[PDB]
């Protein structure tokens, strides 16, 4: 007896005092103080203020700099577009609802805001996967006479959209569902309530396997090889101070990308799993917010790592930001 159920929701607070209300109808100020709703709003404001420029700039700069429009870059643009689905679909909606203390757009809105927020986060997720595959293919050259070209870059992108629909679409049609999470001001996949009529049980397994484990293995293998290949080359060419530099830079970047990926998705996977294997336990609203703070913040830090720390994009940005010059 841990929260309060209704048709399309689960409030993380006991209704023994009779106070719990539908998070689609009235403020949840018994889950958390109003000032904490305001801080939730402050955080979405920060994520918009940083995330929209960074990710918008990335697209804009691509329009202005011919040199950025290569095929290896398409998946990076795809990332920024996904970050923007999270900014406009998620963060802005949540700012709004946080400041009412509840999910004012009701169940339909809850599906929308959940679908678009989840799609974005997943396209970003798979974009980070597809990137590592493409790099591995290009650098470890696991196939002779293969040249990475536009037509491939396009499949790479489309594959991110297919996989992301494979996660976000089903809860619109019976396999899992969208409901308000945490402070009930935003909506995501129901991965914590066992809800037999939608088979949450098995969805969360499908998610855990297909959308965390596969990604994690593909990223680790691809970049493990990359680091192997480059360390090999440099050992076999110690007369090139450049090549030694390259090896170091590549390796630091891999550690960053790998740690970054974990910071973003490990908490959601950690929590899903702890809950799945501690089904008789009580998880409050702020604890269900932690996984989300990590994932959503990636709409800022991923493009810092993948775009701003890429020498080409960076110079183009600085040029475009200095009116034409530098």
């Amino acid at each position: 007896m841990c929260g309060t159920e209704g048709p399309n929701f689960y409030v993380p607070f006991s209704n023994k005092t009779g106070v719990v209300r539908s998070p689609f109808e009235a403020p949840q100020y018994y889950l958390a103080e109003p000032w904490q709703f305001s801080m939730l709003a402050a955080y979405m404001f920060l994520l918009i203020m940083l995330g929209f420029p960074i990710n918008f700039l990335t697209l804009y700069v691509t329009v202005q700099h011919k040199k950025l429009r290569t095929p290896l870059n398409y998946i990076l643009l795809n990332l920024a577009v996904a970050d923007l689905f999270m900014v406009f679909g998620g963060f802005t909606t949540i700012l709004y609802t946080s400041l009412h203390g509840y999910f004012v757009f009701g169940p339909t809105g809850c599906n929308l805001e959940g679908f678009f927020a989840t799609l974005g986060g997943e396209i970003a997720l798979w974009s980070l996967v597809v990137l590592a595959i493409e790099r591995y293919v290009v650098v470890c050259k696991p196939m002779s006479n293969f040249r990475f070209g536009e037509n491939h870059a396009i499949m790479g992108v489309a594959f991110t959209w297919v996989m992301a629909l494979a996660c976000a679409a089903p809860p619109l049609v019976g396999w899992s569902r969208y409901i308000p999470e945490g402070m009930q001001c935003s909506c995501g996949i129901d991965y914590y309530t066992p809800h037999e009529e939608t088979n949450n049980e098995s969805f969360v397994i499908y998610m855990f396997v297909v959308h965390f484990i596969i990604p994690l293995i593909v990223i680790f293998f691809c970049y493990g090889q990359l680091v192997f290949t480059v360390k090999e080359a440099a050992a076999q060419q110690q007369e090139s101070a450049t090549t030694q530099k390259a090896e170091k830079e590549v390796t630091r970047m891999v550690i960053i990308m790998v740690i970054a990926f974990l910071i973003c998705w490990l908490p959601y996977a950690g929590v899903a799993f702890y809950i799945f294997t501690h089904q008789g336990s009580c998880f409050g609203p702020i604890f269900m917010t932690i996984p989300a703070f990590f994932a959503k913040t990636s709409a800022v830090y991923n493009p810092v790592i993948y775009i701003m720390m890429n020498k080409q994009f960076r110079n183009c940005m600085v040029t475009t930001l200095c009116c034409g010059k530098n």
């Binding site: 790099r135 290009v138 650098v139 080359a233 090549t243 390259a246 830079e249 590549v250 020498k311």
Partner: peptide
């Protein structure tokens, strides 16, 4: 192999 590192945004 640095050509491919440059291409891929890693060097």
């Amino acid at each position: 192999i640095l050509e491919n590192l440059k291409d891929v945004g890693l060097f």
